[PDB]
């Protein structure tokens, strides 16, 4: 007994093949799921719930494994998803297939390092390739973005509802631009709140010029409908709060006890008049609310909400532009809840909701999702999440790529052009990666279900002519289609990290030679 006492170890080609095999599985289990003709998957969470979703990330984010590289592959999916959202429909399927041929030189007894060495060379040209075949686009033009978005969203079940989301995604995206960074304003998708409510229909869900609250007026006498209210964000509580120094009182005389009780009354009321002195209309706080003050604030006919979540308070603050306060005496009128086009609290059906509309030029907004069932809704927003995410990426770069595999073949021959001109042993890996690229349109064929081999050869044959690069594969006809008329258009950066991620996967798994278990720490 020597080493680690029942911790398994393995080395070399068996390890190499094993990682090769598992990824082949890993990619394979999803190859059905990309494309406008994709499939859509529903999952068992371990604790009983159901998630039905086409986006691969969550699928893999909902996958438990034992082999490591799969879990290693797992994070790669979620990372690009996190950074890019979609392509997760494709990136891993690219990834394993890259590995799938990547093995093919292992029997060639070629040391992987060079094979890596070519890869880093390969990606460099690839990035250079796409930059050459990218297309900048105006960002002010809405319709192309809408076209881009549907081009971006005509892959998920909301396909039937492209018009709504495209504008829906655009509107919220546009209205989030925080210019205090000079002209380096940055949008946020955490101020892009998403609210899913069942019932109703997709058509009923809409972008709200403001915020929605799953709470109610503390007191009936406060009005449930106001045009141009003033809103207060009291970070502090509204009631008497501990004297923090383990304070103590020793009364001796009778009136003292009754005196002090008024004093807390007095202390609370004190707070009330400080509030009213700014003539506010709406009271919001993350903590509780004294009803006795709430009597006072009722007495002032000033709308009040208690115990509201902080992020919403920020978005509420970002809705009406006011700034939150924890100090009623130090409350400042520059944070008057002005920027409020309409105040209301509707009844959704068994739930009051808070309706805050028509801010002048709001920066925060929540999207109201009104559908059939939350798992349906949750599926929707994931697609929405991707939809909005790519748009900001479009707002981050105006340069666009034609997808549909068109770009893929473009590099493919381009590397082939590189390949033949780059004589040496490394040449064969170089073309092989190009050989790897061709599968994605091919995969698209199967999801359509067409004669993949013939179409692919023709497409490559089609893309042998330099005059045409937008020739790609239609989702439904399964026919060669120039993209310009087809309009499936994509952010270049989306494809960059795609290949960037893809190749990173390759090298990382390739240097592996060994497995060690049972760390026990």
């Amino acid at each position: 007994l020597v080493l680690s006492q029942n911790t398994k170890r393995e080395s070399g080609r068996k390890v190499q093949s094993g990682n090769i095999n598992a990824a082949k599985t890993i990619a394979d289990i999803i190859r059905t799921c990309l494309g406008p003709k994709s499939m859509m998957k529903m999952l068992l969470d371990p604790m009983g719930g159901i998630v039905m979703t086409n986006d691969g990330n969550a699928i893999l984010r909902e996958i438990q494994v034992q082999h490591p590289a799969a879990k290693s592959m797992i994070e790669i999916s979620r990372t690009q998803d996190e950074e890019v959202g979609d392509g997760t429909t494709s990136v891993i399927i690219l990834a394993g297939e890259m590995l799938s041929v990547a093995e093919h030189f292992l029997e060639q007894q070629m040391h992987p390092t060079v094979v890596i060495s070519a890869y880093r060379k390969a990606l460099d040209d690839m990035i250079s390739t796409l930059k050459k075949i990218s297309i900048p686009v105006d960002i002010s033009d809405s319709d192309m973005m809408l076209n881009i978005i549907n081009s971006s969203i005509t892959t998920k079940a909301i396909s039937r509802w492209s018009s709504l989301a495209c504008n829906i995604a655009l509107d919220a995206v546009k209205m989030v631009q925080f210019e205090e960074n000079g002209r380096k304003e940055i949008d946020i998708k955490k101020y892009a709140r998403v609210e899913k409510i069942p019932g109703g229909i997709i058509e009923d869900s809409c972008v709200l010029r403001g915020v929605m609250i799953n709470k109610d007026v503390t007191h009936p006498r406060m009005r449930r409908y106001i045009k141009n209210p003033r809103i207060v964000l009291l970070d502090s509580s509204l009631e008497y709060k501990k004297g923090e120094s383990q304070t103590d009182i020793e009364i001796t005389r009778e009136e003292d006890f009754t005196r002090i009780l008024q004093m807390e009354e007095e202390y609370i009321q004190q707070l009330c008049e400080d509030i009213i002195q700014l003539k506010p209309d709406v009271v919001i706080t993350e903590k509780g609310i004294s009803d006795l003050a709430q009597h006072y604030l009722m007495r002032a006919n000033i709308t009040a909400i208690r115990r509201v979540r902080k992020t919403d308070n920020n978005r509420i603050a970002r809705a009406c532009g006011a700034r939150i306060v924890s100090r009623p005496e130090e409350l400042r009128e520059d944070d008057v809840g002005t920027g409020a086009g309409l105040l209301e609290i509707k009844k959704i059906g068994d739930e009051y909701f808070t309706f805050i509309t028509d801010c002048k030029d709001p920066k925060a907004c929540t999207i109201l999702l009104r559908g059939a069932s939350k798992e349906i809704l949750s599926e929707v927003e994931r697609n929405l999440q991707d939809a909005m995410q790519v748009c900001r990426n479009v707002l981050l770069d105006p340069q666009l790529v034609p997808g549909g595999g068109a770009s893929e073949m473009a590099v493919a021959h381009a590397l082939t052009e590189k390949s033949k001109a780059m004589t040496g042993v490394e040449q064969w890996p170089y073309r092989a990666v190009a050989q790897a690229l061709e599968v994605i349109p091919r995969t698209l064929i199967q999801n359509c279900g067409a004669s993949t081999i013939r179409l692919l050869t023709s497409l490559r044959a089609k893309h042998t002519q330099e005059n045409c690069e937008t020739w790609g594969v239609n989702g439904e006809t399964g026919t060669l289609v120039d993209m310009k008329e087809l309009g499936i258009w994509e952010p270049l950066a989306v494809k960059l990290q795609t290949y960037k991620t893809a190749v990173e996967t390759a090298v990382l798994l390739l240097r592996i030679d060994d497995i060690v278990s049972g760390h026990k720490k």
């Binding site: 859509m40 039937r160 008024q262 559908g371 059939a372 798992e375």
Partner: protein, 525 residues
């Protein structure tokens, strides 16, 4: 495949899970189909805890029928949503669902790829809703109009007599509910139930009833004229929020400390009593108080010597109904006390039942909050009718909500069918198949209606499958002779949005349901 990845994992396959899911609903619809239709049978459930049901609304059944098949649980959710949307027809909704999927299966069983049929459904609903939109009957809020609709809905659950008794109360409530623009159904609707004397005598009370009584024998049980105190501030003792350790040195002070402690609440109650005495200088008038929190016995005694009715520990919503009842000004601070802040009632007594106490609010001049006091012979039945009640109300709220109305009893579905069957392949052809079954699936409602009614299905459908003339009518199936019927003439109706949402709900359910291939289960231990 991924079994390679995980041994303990479980996967299905495209062909496999597809059949499983359709098999799942096909079973699920089979059980529930007994119910919808007035002739249908409600079902009784027994908890593992031994509790008891007598229900018919499927959502209750689905929510309580312990099943594990996932699609059902998914279907359960939207059905619950529909319950949160309208309340009945969830019955039909699932019956719509599985039957569509069954008809859906027929074609894919012919190898048809489902993606095509979905689009057929997509087109199909559109034309249907297009028809659905135009065919709804714009109707005013005529008492009878809703009355029939209420009777239309309520018969789904209970005796013809029982709902008829129930029908009058709900509608008049509805009449006494609106501020002509916006109902919320929560405050003005009080649903309280007593195990008392009948099922039928369950009635609207023009006033309000409370779930508790006075805590003192000298407390007046009954008062002719009630002047109302709505409040929530505790008149129980309280000691201040700061650590405040006191001592004394004399037992005389100890008593002096006794009186001082009480003095604060002493003033509190004192403010009211003076107000009462400022208000009820007359002997005839009676003064009542309501607290959301509790009340000191000494305070109780304080009121007792003044013969003051007061109540403690009310649910946070009751005072709204109270304000919606007596126009009373619900307050916290009694220093700012005004007689105009008061509420007034024309009559109050208390009703003692069993061990509990129930309190009665009567004779608002213009009550805006009312109560569905439920008189009960049997606990489950109270629970049983209540669902029927809440269902019945939510029917009406949409019914008033929509200035239009759908004639019920599935006359629409044939109308849907004929119009939809009257659709050429203006579609790309292959979709006309899915449309055909989509239309085909729609006729289930009368089919099960006849089935639940026992009449032979195939012949009756053909019978009613006779649009008569230029007046090809909205013709229903008779629920007792299995014959063509004008639901409008006989006053059988339904909420348009009901018809609206259910189609939408089911359709979206359907397409995604057909659009899964394997059901994954690879979770942690």
């Amino acid at each position: 495949a991924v079994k390679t990845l995980n041994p303990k994992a479980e996967v299905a396959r495209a062909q496999a899970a597809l059949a499983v899911n359709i098999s799942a609903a096909r079973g699920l619809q089979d059980v529930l189909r007994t119910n919808l239709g007035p002739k249908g049978t409600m079902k009784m459930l027994v908890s593992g805890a031994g509790d008891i049901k007598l229900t018919k609304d499927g959502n209750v059944l689905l929510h309580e029928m312990q099943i594990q098949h996932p699609t059902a649980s998914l279907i359960a959710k939207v059905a619950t949503a529909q319950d949160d949307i309208t309340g009945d027809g969830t019955t039909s909704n699932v019956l719509i669902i599985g039957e569509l999927l069954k008809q859906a299966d027929l074609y894919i069983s012919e190898g048809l790829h489902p993606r095509i049929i979905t689009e057929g459904f997509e087109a199909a609903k559109e034309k249907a809703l297009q028809f659905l939109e135009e065919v709804k009957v714009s109707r005013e809020m005529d008492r009878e109009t809703l009355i029939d609709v209420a009777r239309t809905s309520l018969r789904t659950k209970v005796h013809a007599e029982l709902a008829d008794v129930l029908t009058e109360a709900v509608v008049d409530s509805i009449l006494a509910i609106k501020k002509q623009d916006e109902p919320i159904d929560l405050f003005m609707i009080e649903i309280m139930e007593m195990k008392h004397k009948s099922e039928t005598d369950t009635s609207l009370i023009r006033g309000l009833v409370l779930d508790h009584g006075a805590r003192h024998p000298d407390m007046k049980k009954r008062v002719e004229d009630a002047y109302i105190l709505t409040c929530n501030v505790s008149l129980e003792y309280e000691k201040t929020e700061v650590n405040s350790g006191f001592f004394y040195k004399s037992a005389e002070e100890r008593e002096k400390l006794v009186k001082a402690e009480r003095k604060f609440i002493e003033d509190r109650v004192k403010k009211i009593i003076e107000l009462k005495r400022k208000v009820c200088g007359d002997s005839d008038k009676g003064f009542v108080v309501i607290n959301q929190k509790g009340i000191d016995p000494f305070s109780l005694d304080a009121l007792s010597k003044e013969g003051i009715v007061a109540l403690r520990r009310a649910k946070r919503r009751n005072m709204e109904r109270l304000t919606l009842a007596c126009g009373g000004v619900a307050l916290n601070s009694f220093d700012d006390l005004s007689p105009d802040c008061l509420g007034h009632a024309g009559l109050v007594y208390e009703y003692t039942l069993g061990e509990e106490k129930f309190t009665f609010i009567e004779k608002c001049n213009n009550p805006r909050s009312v109560t569905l006091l439920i008189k009960g012979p049997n606990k489950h039945t109270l629970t049983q009718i209540k669902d029927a009640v809440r269902d019945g109300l939510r029917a009406v709220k949409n019914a008033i909500d929509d200035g239009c109305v759908v004639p019920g009893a599935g006359a629409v579905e044939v109308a849907m069918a004929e119009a939809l069957i009257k659709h050429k392949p203006s579609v790309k052809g292959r979709a006309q198949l899915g449309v055909q079954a989509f239309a085909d699936a729609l006729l289930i409602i009368p089919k099960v209606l006849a089935q639940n009614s026992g009449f032979d299905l195939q012949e009756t459908l053909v019978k009613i499958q006779a649009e008569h003339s230029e007046s090809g009518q909205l013709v229903g199936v008779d629920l007792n002779t299995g014959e063509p019927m004008v639901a409008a003439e006989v006053g059988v109706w339904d909420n348009y949005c009901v018809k609206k949402q259910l189609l939408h709900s089911c359709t979206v359910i359907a397409t995604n349901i057909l659009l899964v291939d394997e059901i994954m289960r690879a979770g942690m231990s």
